[PDB]
Amino acid sequence: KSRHTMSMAPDVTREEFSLVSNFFNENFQKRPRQKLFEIQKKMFPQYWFELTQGFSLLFYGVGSKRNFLEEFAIDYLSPKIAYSQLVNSIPCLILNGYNPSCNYRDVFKEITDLLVPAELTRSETKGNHVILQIQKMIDFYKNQPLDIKLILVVHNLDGPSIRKNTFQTMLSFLSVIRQIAIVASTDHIYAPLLWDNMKAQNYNFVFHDISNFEPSTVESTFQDVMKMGAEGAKYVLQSLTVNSKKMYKLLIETQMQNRGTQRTGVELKLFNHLCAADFIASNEIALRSMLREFIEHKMANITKMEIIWVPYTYAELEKLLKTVLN
Amino acid sequence: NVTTPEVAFREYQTNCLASYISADPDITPSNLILQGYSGTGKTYTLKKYFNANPNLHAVWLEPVELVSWKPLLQAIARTVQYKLKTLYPNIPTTDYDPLQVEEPFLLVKTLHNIFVQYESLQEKTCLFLILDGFDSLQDLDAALFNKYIKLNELLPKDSKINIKFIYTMLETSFLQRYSTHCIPTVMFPRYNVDEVSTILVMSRCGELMEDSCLRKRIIEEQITDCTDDQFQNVAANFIHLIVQAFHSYTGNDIFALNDLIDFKWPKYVSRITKENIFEPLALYKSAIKLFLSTDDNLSQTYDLSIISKYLLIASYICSYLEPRYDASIFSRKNPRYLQPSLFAIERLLAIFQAIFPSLMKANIEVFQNLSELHTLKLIATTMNKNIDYLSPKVRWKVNVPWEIIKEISESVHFNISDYFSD
Amino acid sequence: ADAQRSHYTVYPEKRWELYHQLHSHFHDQVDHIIDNIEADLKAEISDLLYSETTQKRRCFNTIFLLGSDSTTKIELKDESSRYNVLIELTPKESP
Amino acid sequence: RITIKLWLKKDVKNVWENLVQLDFFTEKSAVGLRDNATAAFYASNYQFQGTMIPFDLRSYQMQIILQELRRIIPKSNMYYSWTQL
DNA sequence: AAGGGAAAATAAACAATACATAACAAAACATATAAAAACCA
Ligand SMILES: Nc1ncnc2c1ncn2[C@@H]1O[C@H](COP(=O)(O)OP(=O)(O)OP(O)(O)=S)[C@@H](O)[C@H]1O
C-alpha cells in the first residue's frame, strides 16, 4: 500500500505559516470582498423592519460571518433602534460559540442581570431552576409594553458547547419573548438537524444567505491539525546537555544506516559498546538514565535483539541531522 | 410456649414461625429469613401471626417505601425510640436526633445511647424488627445484607432490651449468595391451581356480595328474595370459572387475580338475567365474550406527516440492507426478526432521495422531521443524547417493530416487502 | 482582540404606518384565539380531574393526554382545607 | 397430529414478565449485584442501551438448559416429546 | 439470436475498529460552623 502521506511533505514552521497566511487573507480577493460588502449593505433596512416582529434572524452561508455580524449588530442596528424609539443605546450581548467554555449557568446569570431585576428573582434561585426562573420571566413579559431592550448575538451556533442539547432548549424559551431580538449565525451543513417543530415554534426562524468566503481568523485558533512528536521533540534538543546531542547523533546514524521503522534500530548492548567506544557511555545505568530523558519526552521507541528505534520518518531524521544536531 | 394462630395453607409454616419466635430473647434466634416470591402472602401470614400475639411487640418497617440505606438507618432509629416511648412511658429519655445518623457506625453508636437509659427494666424483653422487601431495595448490593446481620453482636449483649431481626426478601438467587452464614430460613412455596382458587374465594366473598353493582342489579331486575347464599353461589360460580378460563394466562399469582376480577365483574353483572340466578351454566354461555379475551390493553396510525413518513420508511431499510448490496438494487439508472443495525448520517438521504416520488431538492423540512423523530424515540442515538448534532462519530438506529412499519408503508401506498429478500 | 473571551457585553414612512394599523389589529384576533384554546385545554383537564368517585378508592387516577406538545400548562382549584400542589418531572431530571 | 388455545401476541408478555423475574432467563450482559456501595452507585448514573431497544428485542439468555428439562418434566405431560429436540 | 466475459455475488479466514459499560473524576449544587469583621450603642 504505497501511499503518499502528510509525513512526506515539505513542512513549514510556526512563523513561516502564519505570516504568509496573513498575507493572503488580507490581500487575495480584497476588491471583490468589499464589493460584496457594499451590495449586501442595502439589505440592512430590511433586517431592521422585520426584527421589530420579534423574528429570530439566522444567518447561514459559506465562509466566516463573524466580521459581518459585528458590523451589523454593533454599529448599524443598536443605535438605529434606540433613535427610532424616541440615554445609552441598546446593550449588545454577544455569545462566542466557537469558544467552547460557554456554559448554561454563567450566560444566563448574565441574562437576568442584563434583563430587569424588578423582583427578588434570587428567591426563586434554588436543583435546576433555570427553566423555572425563565418561565416566571416569560409570563410577566407577555403583558409588558412591546419594545426591544436587548439584542443578543450568537456566533457559530453549531459550536462545541452551544450545540449541547440542554443549552439549545434554553435559548428556545428566550426567543418566544417579544422584548429581545435574536441574531445568530451557524456554519454547519447539518445545522437544521438541531431543531424540531417544537423549538422552531418557539424560534420562528427566518434565513438569509451571506457568503463572503472569509478565512475565519479567530475561528481557526482553537482548531488544530498535525501542524499544532517530530515537531515536539524538535525543541527539547535545543536545550539540554551537550553530551545528549552527541549520543543522539551516534543514535541517529546507525538508526538511519539502514520511513524510519523498527527494523533500522539497534541493540542495547552494542549501542552501549558504541557509546563506550567514543568515551561517552560509562555503563548501562549512565546510558539509560540520560536515555530515559529521551524516553520521558517520547523521543525514541523500543520494541523486540533489543531494538531501540526512532519513530520519525526517513526524511525527518536527516532533517534532524543537518539542522539541529549539526 | 406461644399462642399460635391458624390460617389456610401455612400449617407447616405457622409452626416454624411459632418455633423460631418466642417472647424470651435467649430462645429467640438472632436473624431469620422469610423467603418466597410475590404471591404467597408472606406479609399476610406474618401480620396474621402478630395479631394473634399481643404479648410480644413488633416494630414494622417498610424498605420499599424507602430508597436507600442512608434513610433506612434513619428509618430504624426514629422508630425504636418512637416505640419504646409507647411501651415504657415512665422511663425518662434524652431523645436523640434520628436525622443525625447517616453511617452504619452511627446506628450502633446511637443504639448504645438509646438502650442504656432503659437498663432499669425488670426482665430481658425482646423486640422484633421487621423489614419487608429487602431484595427490591433500589440501591442494593452484595455488602449490604451482611452489614445488617452482625448489628446484633456490636450491641452490648447484657442489656435488658434486645433487638432482633426478621428479613423479608425474594428472588432466591439472592439467598444463595449467603447460605454460608446458615441463618435459619423458612421458605414459602408457591401455590397450586386449587389453593389459588381456595384462597381467592374466602378473600373476595366479602366485597363481591356487598358491592353496589350487585345491589343495583338486585333492585333493577325483578328481585326474587335470593339469599345471601344464593349470592354466595353465583359469586362462587364466578370465581371457580374465572380461575378456570384464565389460569394459563396468569400463572399462580394472587395480585394478578385480584384485579382481573375487578375488571370483569361489572361486565359480568350486566349480562345476568332474573332467571339465570338459578341457571348458572347458561349464564356463562350468555356472558361468554369476556371469558375468552384479556381486556388489559387499554395499533395507531401514526400522526407524522408525509415526508416524515417516507423518512421512517427509509430508516427501516437498514435493518437488513447492508452497504454491499443497497447501491446496486436501488440504482437511479431473515433479519425481520433480528435486532437492527447501526446507521450513520446521510445514508438516510442516500436512500431517501432514491425512493421519493428531481421532484424534491429542498431538505430543510426533511431535516426538521429528523429531530422530530428523535423526540418520538423512534430513531435514537447509540451514544449519549448530547453531542449527536455536529457530525462526530454518531451511529443511529430505529426502534419500531415490523408491523407498524408495514401499516405505514401501505398508509402512503409504498411497497416494502419486495426489498426484503432472504 | 477580545473575541477569544466568551460573551463579553458592550454598550455602543407614509407607507409603513398603514401597515401598523393593520398588523396589530390582525394580532388582536390571533392571541384572542390563542387564549381560547388555552382556556379550552385548562377547562377540560379541570372538570375531569375532579368528580370521579370510584368505588375501590385505592387507585390513583391517571390521565393520558394524547397528541400533546409536552408544554401544556395546568392550573389547579383552590379547594380549601386541602393543599393541592403541582410537581413536574422533566426527563432531564430522571436519572 | 390430533384443540389447544393458541394465545395471541399481546398476552404472552404478561407471562414473559414473570419468567424473567423467576430467573429462568437472564439478560445477556447484566452484572447482577455489585460488591460494594460505590460500585453500585457508579452503575446507577449510567443510562442504559438495552431499555432503549424495545421489550421484544432484549436479548435474553438461558438459566436452565434444554437437556436438563427432560429429566424433570414427567413423560405424562404432552410436551415431553419437545424436551428432547 | 448466441455467446464472451467482466461485473456482481458468495464464502471464509483474518485483522482492525467500534461499542457498551465499568470505574472514576470533577464541577455544579448545597450546607455548616468557628473565626473575622462590621456595626450599633
Ligand atoms: N392463607 C391465606 N389465607 C388468606 N389469604 C391469604 C392466604 N395466603 C395469602 N393470602 C392473600 O394473599 C395476599 C398476598 O399478600 P402479599 O403478602 O403482599 O403477597 P406477597 O407474596 O407477600 O407479595 P409481596 O407483598 O410483594 S411480599 C394477601 O393480601 C392475602 O389476602
The DSSP result for B88-156, as a single string, is: -TTS---PPPSSS--SHHHHHHHHHHHGGGGTT-SS-EEEEEEEE-STT-TT--STTTTTTTTHHHHS-
- Residues B191/B252, Cβ–Cβ less than 8 Å: yes
The amino acid present at B353, given as its one-letter code, is: Q
- A110 and C7: CB-CB below 8 Å? yes
Residue with C-alpha cell 440592512?
A: A44
| Per-residue exposure over D47-73, b if at least 16 CB sit within 10 Å of its own CB, e if not | eeeeeebeeeeeeeeeeeeeeeeeeee
- Distance to chain C for A166, nearest Cα, Å: 8
- State, as a whole number of angstroms, the distance between the CA of B300 and the C1' of E21: 35
The amino acid present at B292, given as its one-letter code, is: L
d(CA C67, CA B396): 25
Question: Exposed, middle or buried by CB within 10 Å (0-12, 13-18, 19+), for A198?
Answer: middle
> CB of residue D51 closer than 7 A to nucleic acid strand E?
no
Q: In the structure, which protein residues have their CB atom closer than 6 angstroms to any atom of ligand 1? A: B 7-10, 38-45, 199, 203, 254
Residue C1 in grid coordinates: 482582540
- Distance to chain C for A324, nearest Cα, Å: 35
Name residues 94-123 of chain A with a Cβ under 7 Å from nucleic strand E.
Answer: 103, 105
Task: Tell whether residue B133 is among the known ligand binding residues.
Answer: no
Q: State the chains in contact with B (3 or more Cβ–Cβ pairs under 8 Å).
A: A, C, D
- In D, which residues are within 8 Å of C95 by CB distance? 44-45, 47
User: CB-CB: which of D37, D47, D59 is closest to B141?
Assistant: D37
DSSP lists the bridge partners of residue A60 as A209
- Residues D54/B401, Cβ–Cβ less than 8 Å: yes
CATH number for the domain whose boundaries are B11-187: 3.40.50.300
The amino acid present at B9, given as its one-letter code, is: F
- B171 and D54: CB-CB below 8 Å? no
- Residues B134/B63, Cβ–Cβ less than 8 Å: yes
| Per-residue exposure over A73-86, b if at least 16 CB sit within 10 Å of its own CB, e if not | bbeebbeebbeeee
Question: Exposed, middle or buried by CB within 10 Å (0-12, 13-18, 19+), for B17?
Answer: buried
User: CB-CB: which of B372, B386, B391 is closest to A190?
Assistant: B391
> CB of residue A142 closer than 7 A to nucleic acid strand E?
no
Residue B33 in grid coordinates: 429469613
Chain B's closest residue to A198, CA to CA, is B372
- In A, which residues are within 8 Å of C3 by CB distance? 66, 96, 218
- State, as a whole number of angstroms, the distance between the CA of A103 and the C1' of E25: 19
* Residue nearest (by alpha carbon) to ligand 1 atom 4: B199
d(CA B311, CA B355): 10
Query: Which nucleotide C1' is nearest A109 CA?
Result: E28
Q: Which of D85, D69, D65 is nearest to D77 (CA)?
A: D69
- φ/ψ of residue A36, rounded to 5: -70, -40
User: CB-CB: which of A166, A188, A194 is closest to B371?
Assistant: A194
Which ranges of B180-305 would DSSP assign to H, the alpha helix? 193-208, 212-220, 228-242, 247-250, 255-270, 280-286
Instruction: Name, in order, each residue with C-beta under 8 angstroms of D41's C-beta and a sequence gap of 6 or more.
Output: B139
Chain C's closest residue to B213, CA to CA, is C55
d(CA A267, CA A302): 10
d(CA A153, CA A57): 10
d(CA B398, CA A186): 29
Q: Does residue A132 sit at the B interface (CB-CB below 8 Å)?
A: no
Strand, helix or coil at B165? strand
d(CA B372, CA A198): 8
CA end-to-end span of chain B: 73
- State, as a whole number of angstroms, the distance between the CA of B331 and the C1' of E2: 28
Query: Which nucleotide C1' is nearest B99 CA?
Result: E31
The amino acid present at B75, given as its one-letter code, is: A
> CB of residue D44 closer than 7 A to nucleic acid strand E?
no
Distances (CA, A) of B115 to A157, B76, B88, B197, B422: 65, 14, 12, 48, 75
Alpha carbon dihedral A11, A15, A21, A26, in 10-degree steps, equals -170
Instruction: Name, in order, each residue with C-beta under 8 angstroms of B24's C-beta and a sequence gap of 6 or more.
Output: B124, B126
Q: Which residues in chain B precede a discontinuity of more than 2.5 Å between C and N?
A: 298, 333, 357
- In A, which residues are within 8 Å of B389 by CB distance? 158, 163, 165, 188, 190, 193-194
The amino acid present at B395, given as its one-letter code, is: R
Instruction: Name, in order, each residue with C-beta under 8 angstroms of B136's C-beta and a sequence gap of 6 or more.
Output: B63, B64, B170
Q: State the chains in contact with C (3 or more Cβ–Cβ pairs under 8 Å).
A: A, B, D
- Residues A83/A203, Cβ–Cβ less than 8 Å: no
- Residues A88/C11, Cβ–Cβ less than 8 Å: yes
Largest CA distance in chain C: 73
Tell me which of B311, B345, B367, B383 to substitute to probe the interface with A (most A C-beta atoms closer than 10 Å). Answer: B367
Q: Which nucleotides of E are covered by protein (CB under 7 A)?
A: 8-10, 18-25, 28-30
- In A, which residues are within 8 Å of B368 by CB distance? 192, 195-197, 200
Which ranges of chain A would DSSP assign to H, the alpha helix? 14-24, 30-39, 44-50, 66-70, 78-85, 104-114, 121-124, 130-141, 165-175, 197-203, 242-254, 268-277, 284-296, 314-320
* Residue nearest (by alpha carbon) to ligand 1 atom 26: B38
- In A, which residues are within 8 Å of B367 by CB distance? 190, 192-193
Pairing of strands B396-398, B379-381: antiparallel
Q: Which of B218, B200, B211 is nearest to B266 (CA)?
A: B211
Strand, helix or coil at A131? helix
Tell me which of C56, C61, C94 to substitute to probe the interface with B (most B C-beta atoms closer than 10 Å). Answer: C56
CA end-to-end span of chain D: 17
The amino acid present at B122, given as its one-letter code, is: Q
Question: Exposed, middle or buried by CB within 10 Å (0-12, 13-18, 19+), for B1?
Answer: exposed
> CB of residue D38 closer than 7 A to nucleic acid strand E?
yes
In this complex, which residue's CA is closest to the C1' atom of nucleotide E20? D49
d(CA B140, CA B167): 14
- Residues B148/B166, Cβ–Cβ less than 8 Å: no
Resolution in A: 8.1
> CB of residue A166 closer than 7 A to nucleic acid strand E?
no
- Distance to chain B for D35, nearest Cα, Å: 5
User: CB-CB: which of A165, A190, A197 is closest to B368?
Assistant: A197
- Residues B80/B114, Cβ–Cβ less than 8 Å: yes
DSSP code for A77: I
Cα B39 to middle of ligand 1, angstroms: 6
Strand, helix or coil at B380? strand
Cα A304 to middle of ligand 1, angstroms: 70
Q: Does residue C14 sit at the B interface (CB-CB below 8 Å)?
A: no
Q: Does residue D44 sit at the C interface (CB-CB below 8 Å)?
A: yes
Residue with C-alpha cell 395546568?
A: C74
Cα-only R_g, chain B: 32
Task: Tell whether residue B42 is among the known ligand binding residues.
Answer: yes
d(CA B349, CA A190): 12
Q: Which of C19, D42, D15, A237 is nearest to B251 (CA)?
A: D15
* Residue nearest (by alpha carbon) to ligand 1 atom 13: B41
d(CA B123, CA B339): 67
- Residues A164/C92, Cβ–Cβ less than 8 Å: no
